[PDB]
Amino acid sequence: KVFGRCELAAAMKRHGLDNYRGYSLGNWVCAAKFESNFNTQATNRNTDGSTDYGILQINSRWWCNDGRTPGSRNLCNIPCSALLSSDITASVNCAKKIVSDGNGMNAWVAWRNRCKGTDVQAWIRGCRL
């Protein structure tokens, strides 16, 4: 599913991501924009042989099982395919664990490089919330 911007903002809020660990909703929408362009089916292979999955590009090195990432963990206790669903529940629940792991949203390199310190409220402007 390719979400609309305000549609995703609303879905993230319903799932408790707004202000989670202190990160406003616009931070999460901005991260999803640059990670996946709001496409739940996005996948990308990493240099190390892990793969990133879904709207927030969650990585099989630590967070999900894809059967092909040697030595990896599955800390969200999910198949990586769950992160590709039109329903964002699994991605949101796993993102909550990731952002709690110590480095906040810096876990998403694209958030650090493209969202952090910017006017992230622009990403939710106009949306009914």
Site string for Cl ion, 6-35 (x = CB under 5 A): xx---x------------x-x---------
Interatomic CA distance for residues 58 and 30, integer angstroms? 15
Is 18 annotated for ligand binding? no
The reply to whether 7 belongs to the active site is no
Asked if residue 72 binds Na ion (CB under 5 A), the reply is yes
Q: Measured in Å, how far apart are the chain's first and last C-alpha atoms? A: 21
22 — alpha (psi -120 to 50), left (phi > 0) or beta?
left
Query: Site for Cl ion (CB under 5 A): which residue of 13, 43, 74, 85?
Result: 74
Closest CA to 67 of 83, 43, 51: 51
The reply to whether 48 belongs to the active site is no
Helix pair 25-36, 5-14: axis angle to 10 deg:
130
Asked if residue 60 binds Na ion (CB under 5 A), the reply is yes
Q: Contact positions toward Na ion, by CB under 5 A? A: 60, 65, 69, 72, 74
Bind-site residues for substrate: 101
| Positions marked active-site | 35, 52
